[PDB]
Structures are given as structure tokens and as C-alpha cells.
Nucleic acid binder design. Structure first.
Ligand code: NA
Ligand code: NA
Ligand code: NA
Lengths: 62, 63
RNA sequence: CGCGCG
RNA sequence: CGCGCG
């Protein structure tokens, strides 16, 4: 997916083990947070991302 | 509108409750808006939110 | 306030 | 699936 690739690339740019929020991704990638989150939770289900549950949750490459 | 929901849930009958989904259909209002109003009415002590899923809403029993 | 929800 | 979220 186009969006999946953008998100995964953003994270890879940060360096190994680094995490970000949907809030941040939404701003930097110019994409509504609802869409960001739809793709973040999906990727996690596919095992491509790890969610660190919090408020807000943090997301990294799996 | 708060007064619209209160009247409808009043006319539903004594001790009767229904869902936001049901109110949404019956009042021709998006569930989003229905729910915003229900939760605010509960804060105000005018409705009771029953536990469970989907939540049930009824007129508060008052003193 | 965690919200991804169709 | 509970969603009301500004
Ligand atoms: Na409800
Ligand atoms: Na929802
Ligand atoms: Na929300």
C-alpha cells in the first residue's frame, strides 16, 4: 500500500528501535490521523509494526 | 437537541430504555450527534446510562 | 482522550 | 464495536 510504505519509510528514517505517534505521523506526512491509525493498526496485525500501548500509543518497526 | 431526546425517552414508557442506534433511526439524526447529547445529559443527571453493550439509556429516577 | 470504528 | 473525541 502507498500509505503503508510512507509510514514504514518515515520510521526507518529515524533509525532502528525508534518510535513515533499517530499524531506525529499525521502532521509530518500530511494525512488525517484517522487514516494514519487505520494503517498503523493494520500493519501491526500483519506483524510489520509493534504497538507500545500508551496514551498515546507508540509505534515502531516490528 | 437534549429536549427532543428527553421527550422521546419519556414517551417510551416507565422504566423503558433504548440504544443510541435506535434513537438515531427514530429521530433521523446521526448516531454521532445522538451520542454526544446522551453522554452530556447523563453528566447533567437527566439520564441514566445502563451498563453493557450497546449502552441503554433511560430517564433518570429522581428524588 | 486510549479512537483504529466501516 | 463499548465510540461520545471537539
Ligand atoms: Na450509546
Ligand atoms: Na466508533
Ligand atoms: Na476519538
Amino acid at each position: 500500500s502507498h500509505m503503508e510504505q510512507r509510514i514504514l519509510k518515515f520510521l526507518e528514517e529515524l533509525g532502528e528501535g525508534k518510535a513515533t505517534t499517530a499524531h506525529d505521523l499525521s502532521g509530518k506526512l500530511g494525512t488525517p490521523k484517522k487514516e494514519i491509525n487505520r494503517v498503523l493498526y493494520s500493519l501491526a496485525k500483519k506483524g510489520k509494526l509493534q504497538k507500545e500501548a500508551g496514551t498515546p500509543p507508540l509505534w515502531k518497526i516490528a
